[PDB]
């Protein structure tokens, strides 16, 4: 029969309104810069689609990032090049400040404000109640303007949230497999993390929207507050199905299955099985009660969720009583 078609609730038709430019990223046009106006000091990390730089700049010798891409498709590096000079000044947002082309290996690379290093996975030990709402308001800032911008960052994730502690600063990175929403369109379901990927991934439901970002943020949430990183740990794309499965109960999932006439591999049929719906009361130990609320679950309960349309939006999120005390500070 094939799988019912579904469209975002929100933010749904904004890049039709919007001139091609913007969204046809295959179409633009890049102004190369120089390398020989950056010096790079010392490599930050090692990535599957990149390396990455501190570095400095001789004009007014001031530190930068610099991201030099490993052999990607073209349209793949214009689309992160063009999503990221139309998310330029946003919320939260990683800033491109410039597009230099290598002398040696003669890949482009990109070039970020310098951010305080610091990766959001290390400070989980360390973070107080207060610390988590702050910081999940703050991605929530950056989610729903990118979603507001017609664009799904497709790997939220730990690994990808810049944090500067110390003056409370957050920036939401790695922008190199975001994509922009067009209503009816059919994505690949091969992005994001394995540990964050969305049922309709596992699934194979390629006409997803802006929702994924949430259950990725749900599952970042969830990790912080149960302090159990990652939550669902699954060995591979099957398995992860199966462990998420086992705590939101496999009554809920085959309705899913059922409502969008989803064609399921047949081998989720023998490792899925009979599961029940855990209550997150489950999950609370005695390491992890100061973080647990009934604020907290409340909260990501409507954010992990079978059905893409039934997780909350960014904007929704932002609004839920768990960021009550959050809000009211900012003000
Ligand atoms: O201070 C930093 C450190 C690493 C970074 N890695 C990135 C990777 C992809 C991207 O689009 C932006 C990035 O910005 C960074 C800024
Ligand atoms: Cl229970």
Redesign the pocket.
């Known amino acids: 029969s094939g799988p019912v078609p579904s469209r975002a609730r929100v933010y749904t038709d904004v890049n039709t309104h919007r001139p091609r430019e913007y969204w046809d990223y295959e179409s633009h046009v890049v102004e190369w810069g120089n390398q020989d106006d950056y010096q790079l000091v010392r490599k930050?990390g090692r990535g599957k689609y990149?390396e990455?730089f501190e570095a400095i700049n001789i004009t007014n010798n001031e530190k930068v990032?610099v991201?030099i891409l490993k052999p990607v498709k073209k349209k793949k590096i214009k689309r992160?090049i063009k999503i990221?000079e139309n998310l330029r000044g946003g919320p939260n947002i990683?800033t491109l400040a410039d597009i230099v082309k290598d002398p040696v290996s003669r890949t482009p690379a990109?070039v970020?404000e310098?951010?305080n290093?610091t990766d959001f996975k290390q400070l989980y030990q360390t973070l107080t109640d207060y610390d988590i709402r702050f910081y999940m308001y703050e991605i929530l800032k950056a989610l729903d303007y990118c979603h507001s911008m017609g664009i799904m960052h497709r790997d939220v994730k730990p690994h990808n949230v810049?944090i500067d502690h110390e003056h409370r600063k957050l920036?939401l990175?790695?922008?190199?497999l975001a994509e922009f929403y067009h209503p009816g369109q059919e994505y690949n379901v091969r992005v994001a993390s394995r540990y964050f990927k969305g049922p309709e991934l596992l699934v194979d439901y390629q006409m997803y929207d802006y929702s994924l970002d949430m259950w990725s943020l749900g599952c970042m949430l969830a990790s912080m507050i149960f302090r159990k990183e990652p939550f669902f740990h699954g060995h591979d794309n099957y398995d992860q199905l199966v462990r998420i499965a086992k705590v939101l109960g496999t009554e809920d999932l085959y309705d899913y299955i059922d409502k969008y006439n989803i064609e399921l591999d047949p081998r989720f049929n023998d490792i899925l099985g009979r599961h029940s719906r855990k209550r997150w009361e489950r999950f609370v130990h005695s390491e992890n009660q100061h973080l647990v609320s009934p604020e907290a679950l409340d909260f990501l309960d409507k954010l992990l969720r079978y059905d893409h349309q039934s997780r909350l939006t960014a904007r929704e999120a932002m609004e839920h009583p768990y960021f009550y005390t959050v809000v009211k500070d900012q003000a």
Request: net charge neutral; charged share 20%.
């Open positions: 930050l990149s990455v990032v991201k992160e990221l990683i990109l970020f310098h951010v290093n810049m920036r990175i790695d922008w190199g």
